[PDB]
Amino acid sequence: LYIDETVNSNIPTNLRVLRSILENLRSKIQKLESDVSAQMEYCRTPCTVSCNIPVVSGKECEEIIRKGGETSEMYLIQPDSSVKPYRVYCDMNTENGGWTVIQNRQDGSVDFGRKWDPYKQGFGNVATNTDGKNYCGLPGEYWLGNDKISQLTRMGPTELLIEMEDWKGDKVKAHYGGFTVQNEANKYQISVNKYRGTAGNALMDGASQLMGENRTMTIHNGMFFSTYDRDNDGWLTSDPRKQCSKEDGGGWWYNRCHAANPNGRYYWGGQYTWDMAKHGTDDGVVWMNWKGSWYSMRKMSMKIRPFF
Amino acid sequence: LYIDETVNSNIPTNLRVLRSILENLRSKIQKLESDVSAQMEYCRTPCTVSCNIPVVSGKECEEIIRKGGETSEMYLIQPDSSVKPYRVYCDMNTENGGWTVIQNRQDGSVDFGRKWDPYKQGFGNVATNTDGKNYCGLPGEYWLGNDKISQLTRMGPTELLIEMEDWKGDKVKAHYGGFTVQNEANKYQISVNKYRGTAGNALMDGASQLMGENRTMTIHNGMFFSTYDRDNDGWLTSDPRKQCSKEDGGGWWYNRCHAANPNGRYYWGGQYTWDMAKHGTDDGVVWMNWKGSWYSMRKMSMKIRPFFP
Amino acid sequence: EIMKYEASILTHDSSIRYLQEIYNSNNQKIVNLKEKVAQLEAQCQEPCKDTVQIHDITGKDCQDIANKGAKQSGLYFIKPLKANQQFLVYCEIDGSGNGWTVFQKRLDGSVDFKKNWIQYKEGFGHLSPTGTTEFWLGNEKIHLISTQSAIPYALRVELEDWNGRTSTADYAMFKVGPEADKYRLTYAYFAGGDAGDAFDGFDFGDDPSDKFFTSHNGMQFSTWDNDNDKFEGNCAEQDGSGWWMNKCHAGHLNGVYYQGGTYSKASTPNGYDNGIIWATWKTRWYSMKKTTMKIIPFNRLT
Amino acid sequence: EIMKYEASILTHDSSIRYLQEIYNSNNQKIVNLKEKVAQLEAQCQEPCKDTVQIHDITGKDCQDIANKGAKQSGLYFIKPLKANQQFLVYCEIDGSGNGWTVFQKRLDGSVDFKKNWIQYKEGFGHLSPTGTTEFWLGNEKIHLISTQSAIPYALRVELEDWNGRTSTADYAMFKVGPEADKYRLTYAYFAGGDAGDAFDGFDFGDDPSDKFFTSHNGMQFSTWDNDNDKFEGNCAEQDGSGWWMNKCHAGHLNGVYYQGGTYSKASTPNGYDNGIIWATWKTRWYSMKKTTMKIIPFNRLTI
Amino acid sequence: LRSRIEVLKRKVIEKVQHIQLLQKNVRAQLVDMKRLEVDIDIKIRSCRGSCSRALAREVDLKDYEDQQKQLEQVIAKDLL
Amino acid sequence: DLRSRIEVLKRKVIEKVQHIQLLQKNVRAQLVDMKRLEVDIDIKIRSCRGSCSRALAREVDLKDYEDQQKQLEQVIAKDLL
Ligand SMILES: [Ca+2]
Ligand SMILES: [Ca+2]
Ligand SMILES: [Ca+2]
Ligand SMILES: [Ca+2]
Ligand SMILES: [Ca+2]
Ligand SMILES: [Ca+2]
Structure with a gap:
């Protein structure tokens, strides 16, 4: 008598629900199947910029601002005769302004999940042009090569500033008066000190x-x-x-x-x-x-x- | 009866006198004979001067004094681009001072009995240095060439002053408000007027x-x-x-x-x-x-x- | 005793089977979809391409570079003998194979020329591989080039009005001195040019001194914060620029960019002729549409 | 017969004959004597020889002349482009073949430099083919030379104390303006010189204005009868000369020739430093023994 | 009819067993999708800095979470 | 009685007086010639002052010539009728 009929009008329930979400995903899948091809299309043609180099240049942003580099934008620098001069974004405002941006995140327009080589060499977009203006006064998401970085940190006593922001607009800094990055041989071993931030x-x-x-x-x-x-x-x-x-x-x-x-x-x-x-x-x-x-x-x- | 005894002791008188002056001249002659050779010796070497030209210059003495030529002395002038600039003695005192000396006598140190060419060309000493001073502030006896003169007179209305002096120191002038000298072709024909002097x-x-x-x-x-x-x-x-x-x-x-x-x-x-x-x-x-x-x-x-x- | 259930289970039996086939199909489609994103991700790996590029050819100056082979007028890295480091410049190379190292260019007034001493020494403005940019190379730079190997250099100045009409003015034995001498301008003479020799001064008409009071040969460079003019006041601060001022000027290229060209003493409170001017070619109240200052070793003469 | 007079006539006969021979001889000697004076007169026919002479070479300036061939530094006739007429000058030509047109020279104080405007424009003093004379060429002349063909000129100033010790000061882009602009002095800069740049002014010590109050660049020429100084009073009349005065000076070459050099405010009633001075080389109370101002196209540069 | 039902309950359970298993399979597929959906969202935005244009797309986490929630509640009991 | 001797004597005497009277004239002129010469030279020498290194500091004694001149004219009068 303890026979269970419910499992005849109990299962259809534990079943009907399974049908819903299952079909739900089937469509969801073929939905993503489209967005990708669309983006793939967009990608047939690349994005472009035209950043004319400022006349002023130096060993790095510091020298530049000292040299009259007043505005925050892309500048060309050259640490020494050996290194080929490279583009970088200088932040001439924030603290004092001799800010050589080594890394920058803001919108997620650049893939950071990358391999050893791209990191050592550097990747992403340094800066981009504004509306109507010829020069690239706005930074882009990027990563200066590890070498480019290592070389700089070891060029002399370097202070490091790390600024961040939440999705609520709030910001906090993280200051490290000391900063170093060894050569590739030492696997770019990092070393910092003298903390004085808020994050x-x-x-x-x-x-x-x-x-x-x-x-x-x-x-x-x-x-x-x-x-x-x-x-x-x-x-x-x-x-x-x-x-x-x-x-x-x-x-x-x-x-x-x-x-x-x-x-x-x-x-x-x-x-x-x-x-x-x-x-x-x-x-x-x-x-x-x-x-x-x-x-x-x-x-x-x-x-x-x-x-x- | 008709004895001219006298003419035996009359002639010796009319004779003795003739001997005196005759021998007198004979010696006088050989006297002159010496003075000349001496002068001839002096002439082996010429006289010299060193007249440094004043910075200021003009078409002639007038322009010069107007240009600040204050002192009377030798100055260099140039009537026009054609004529080569020539030395002249400017008298910046006398009447007003724009005096371009065209002729000057004072001691008889220059021969004026000369021929046509010397006159037309000009001759003599314009000026001479003083004692110790470098420039020739004193005029010399001279004659600016007839051309040099002619050209000037005909350059415009020219007034002519002639000053003279006797051996008693007395002086007199002879002023001619008008003066001209034609070209050589017209044989340097002279013409003056408007007399107002004292001589x-x-x-x-x-x-x-x-x-x-x-x-x-x-x-x-x-x-x-x-x-x-x-x-x-x-x-x-x-x-x-x-x-x-x-x-x-x-x-x-x-x-x-x-x-x-x-x-x-x-x-x-x-x-x-x-x-x-x-x-x-x-x-x-x-x-x-x-x-x-x-x-x-x-x-x-x-x-x-x-x-x- | 009815057991009308074994007949309903088979209905569910197929229902189950149906879903299984959908689940299994989805799994497959998903596997496929992942092989597509990987293909997509590969696309979005390179940055946006910057149309601007520097040339691999390097020399002592734009001319030395041309001799080496350069054929296009763009951006190159030159480095004179007594130079601490190399530095970028815009070169102009013609059909005759001449290298014009340009140090000043005006064309739209997008760059404010009211810059201090330091800003004029190290240089200001932007460099374009097409010379469609405005700038000032830098006195120190200009110095190093003009004063190297003790070799003869020349300067050409190109002007343009608001009717496309242009002119030039050349100066032989061009040279700019060291900072210790305030980067003084110097040239043997004017090599001729349809624009005129404003550098020889210019007697405007106010005073009879205007000429030698507006000559630029032998004049030191001055700024509002580094007066070196032969003026009791500050010519540089007055006009609001950086230039080799005497009792001010007669040829002022770093002057205020006046649109349309023509201006006046009305366009200024105290009424100045602080525009991009060149007295011998145009009025003191007619500002140029385009300006360009470039040098080259003198021996490449016309 | 008693009276033998026909024996005395023969005595007289010979007496007469004697005299005739003397008269006849005198006549001859006279004829000879006249042939001698003619020979003498020929001598006294030429004037005294003036040691001074002008050179036949002519140009736009002493330098242009040198290029033509001139080798000796003497008196020549130059004539710039915009010149109404030519005019004499003293040229200085060195071994390197340079033509220095000189416009001012002091050496003995024989020439009074207290001259009016006109006297400084047309020029005063004397010209010697050996530069042993004192003078002032004339602003107008100086103007014409320096401001011709719009070509670059330079100025050298040579000084000498009473110990033969000398010095120079050069100014590039030298130029003197027209009369309309009171013959104002102008030069791009100081080209260097062991004597110093007095023209750059000089802060003596009385006031902190002394420097720019004694700078001569850009200053107009002034005289007692043509004040153009930047002084309330008359610097020219005060010092008694003609010069480009500011709030007077720091480099005054036409100043009073003070023998021996050294002087003071005692040598003047109101006590002025109106001597031939150059603050950068010597005291304000040490007057030069010799002064010489000459120009030349700048192109003779290498030093 | 002791056995003529003794085997029925047996076969039913076999069916309930197929169902209970599927629940697990969907659970994971649901989780797999959630991550995929997200993964793509990131890939596309990172494409903004390389391609001429990016896709103005959105993500409905809410729905997946609904489906997630609605599933866990179904997992309870079918036969003691 | 010695007519002839004297008759021819007086004759010859006159001949001698004639030689004398003639000489007077010759000297007269020679005297004038000298006077002029003496002067002429004085002038030539002074005009030399403006040409030669030095001139001669000479004088002229007109007085003496004038003496001689005077002293001569007085001798001319008569010797024999
Ligand atoms: Ca990745
Ligand atoms: Ca590990
Ligand atoms: Ca004669
Ligand atoms: Ca006749
Ligand atoms: Ca100033
Ligand atoms: Ca005054």
């Missing part, structure tokens, strides 16, 4: 939400640079499935992963979840000591200037 | 000691220039022995000879006689209307200045 000393102190060794092993100072195709992280395990930089993961100075990653994936809106991340990781543009764990910043950048 | 109008009126035609034929105005080797005088006779300018005679504008001659022979002391003159003539530096006939002036000059209406 949180994520580089020397690790995440302010972790305890004991957990916190201590997320410090980036003294860490090596790593890309999804080059392991140099603090994760010494022999297990292949465990690396701090997975595919399409920003190259950064990892150590048992991180406390911050300004090169992480650009998640729109800031907050993002595990079921959204490619590998179920915190791969976005994070800065734990400030906006927390699963939160990608709206604006993030790294500039450089000689510390006197 | 006597010898040029337009002739000698004040002669009557009728005698006086009228000694007028120099309109006369031609003549030298001892170039007859253009008023003496039209065909007789060769009769010319107004004989050898060593100053070249001047003669007419049946003269009333005045500032280029005549420089006789020392003023008064001179017929038995002294080479040809027994009144060939000295004369000005009849003043000091008379046989009297050579101690100082005599001819200046020039542009007369303004």
Whole structure:
């Protein structure tokens, strides 16, 4: 008598629902199937710019502003006779103005999940033209080559400024009076000091939400640079499935992963979840000591200037 | 009975005297015979001067003084682009100062009895240095060339001043507000007027000691220039022995000879006689209307200045 | 006892099977879709192409470069003998194979020429590979070029009115001195030009001094913050620019860009002729439409 | 017979004969004597020889003349382009073949430099073919030369103390303006010289204005009878000369010739430093022994 | 008819077993889609800095979350 | 009685007086010639002052010539009727 008929008009319910979302995805799929081909079409033709070089130039932005470089825009510099002169975006405003932008995020128009070579060589758009104006007075998202960076940091005492912004418009800085990047041979080993910001000393102190060794092993100072195709992280395990930089993961100075990653994936809106991340990781543009764990910043950048 | 005894002790007297002066001359001769050789020696070496040219210069003395030429001395002038600039003595004092000395006598240091060419070209010493001073602030006896003169007179209305002086220091002027000298082609025909001096109008009126035609034929105005080797005088006779300018005679504008001659022979002391003159003539530096006939002036000059209406 | 259920399960049996085939198909389509994005992602990997590019040819000056082979007038890196470092410039190369190192160009007034001493020394403005940009190379730079190897240089000045009509003026033995001598202008003479020798001064008409009071040969460079003019006041500050001023000027190219050309003492409170002018060619109140200052070793003469 | 007189006539006969021979001899000697004076007169026919002479070479300026061939520094006739007439000048030509047209020279104070406007325009003093004379060429002349063919000219100033010690100062782009502009002095700059740039003014020490109050660049020429100085009073009349005065001077070459050089405010009633001075080389109370101002087309540069 | 039903319940469970399994399969496919949807959104924006134009697209996380929620609630019980 | 001797004597005497009377005239002129010469030279020498290094500081004694001149004219009167 304990026969169960319900499972004749109980299943159709646990079934009907399965039909809905299943068909829901089937259409959702073929929807994405279109957006891609459209973008693929757009891509038949590239984007272009025309940035005429300012007459004034120097070893870097500092010398330039000292030389009269008043406005923030793309400038051409040359650290020495050896290095071929290269384009860079100078920020002549912010603190004092001798700001040589080493990294910049603002809209997610550039792929940061790139391999070793692109990072060492540098990639992205430095600046872009404005409406009607001939010169490129606006920066673009980019990454100056590691070499280009390494060379500069080692050229003399360099101070590093890191500015960021949330999706609520709020901004915070992170100042490091000392900054260095070794040659490729030393795997671009990073070293900073003299913190004096407002966002949180994520580089020397690790995440302010972790305890004991957990916190201590997320410090980036003294860490090596790593890309999804080059392991140099603090994760010494022999297990292949465990690396701090997975595919399409920003190259950064990892150590048992991180406390911050300004090169992480650009998640729109800031907050993002595990079921959204490619590998179920915190791969976005994070800065734990400030906006927390699963939160990608709206604006993030790294500039450089000689510390006197 | 008819004994001219005397002529035995009468002749010795009319003879003894003849011996005196005759031997007197014989020695006098050989005396002159020495003075010449001495002078001839002196002449082995010439006299010299060093006249540094004043910075200021003009068309002539007038322009110069207007240009600041204050002192009387030698200046360099240039009437026009054509003529080569020539040295001249400017007298910046006398009347007003624009005085371009055209002629000057003062000591008899220059031979005026010269031929046609020297006169036309000009001769003598314009000026000479002083003691210690570098520039030649003192004039010398000279004659600007006839051309140099002619050109100036014809350059515009020119007034002519003639100053003279006797051996007694007395001076007199002879002013002619009008003065001209034609080209060589017109034989440098002279023409003056507007007399206003103190020495006597010898040029337009002739000698004040002669009557009728005698006086009228000694007028120099309109006369031609003549030298001892170039007859253009008023003496039209065909007789060769009769010319107004004989050898060593100053070249001047003669007419049946003269009333005045500032280029005549420089006789020392003023008064001179017929038995002294080479040809027994009144060939000295004369000005009849003043000091008379046989009297050579101690100082005599001819200046020039542009007369303004 | 009815058991009319075994007949309904088979209905569900097919229902299940249907869904399975959809799930399985979706999975496949998804696998395909992923192989497409990878293909797309490959596209979006290069940056936007900047139309501007520098030439690999390098020399002591635009002329030396041309000799090496340069055929197009664009942007190159020159480096004179006594130069600390190289630096970019705009070269002008003609059919005859001449290299014109340009140091000043005006054409639209997009660049404010009211710049200080330092701004005129290191140079200001922008460089275009097509000379459609306005700029000032830099006195120090200009100095280094003109004063090298003790070799003879010349200067050409090209002018243009608002009717496309142009003219030039050349100066032989052109040279600009060191900073210690305020980058003084100097040239042996005027090599001729349909525009006229404004550098020889110009007697306007106010005073009889105007001529030698407006000559630019031998004049030192001056700015509002570095007066070197032969004026009691500050010519540079007055006109609002950087130039070799005497008792001001007669040929002023860094003057205020006056649109349409013609201006007046009405277009200024105190009434100045602070425009891009050249007395010998045009009025003191007629500003140029285009201006260009370039040099070249003298021996490439016309 | 008693009376033998027919024996004395023969005595007289010989007496007569004697005299005849003397008269006849005198006549001859006279004839000879006349042939001698003619020979003498020929001597005294030429004037005294003036050691001074002008050179037949002519040009636009002393330099142009040198290019034509001139080798000795003497007196020549130059004539610029816009010149009404030619005019004499003293040229200085060196071994390198340079023609220095000189316009001012002091050396003994024989020439009074207290001259009026006209006297400074047309020029005053004397010209010697050996430059042993003192003078002022004339502003108008100086003008014509410096401002011709619009070609670059330069000025050198040579100084000498009472110890033979000398110095020079050069100014590039030298030029003197027209009379309409009071013959104003102008030059691009100082080309260097061991004597110093007095023209750049000189801050003596009385007032902090002294420097720009004694600069001569851009100053107009002035005289007692033609004030153009930047002084309330008359600098020219005060010092007693003709010069381009500002609030007077720092480099005054036409100043009073003070023998021995050194002077003071004692040597003047109101006490002026009106001597031939050059502040950068010597004191304001040390007058030069020799002064010489000459120009030449700038192109003779290499130093 | 003890067995003529004893085998019925047996076969039913077999069917309920196919269903319970599918739930798991969709769950994951749903998660796979969510990530994909997102992944693409990022790829496209990063394309803005390389191609002539980017796509003005949006993402409806909400719907997926609906589907997510609506699924977990169905997973409860079918036969004790 | 010595008619002839004296008759021819007086005759010859006159002949001698004739030689004398003639000489007077010759000297007269020679005297005048000298006077002029003496003067002529004085003039030539002074005109030399303006040409030669030095002139001669000479004088002229007209007085003496005039003496001689006077002293001669007085001798001319008569010797024999
Ligand atoms: Ca590892
Ligand atoms: Ca990637
Ligand atoms: Ca006749
Ligand atoms: Ca004679
Ligand atoms: Ca000033
Ligand atoms: Ca005054």
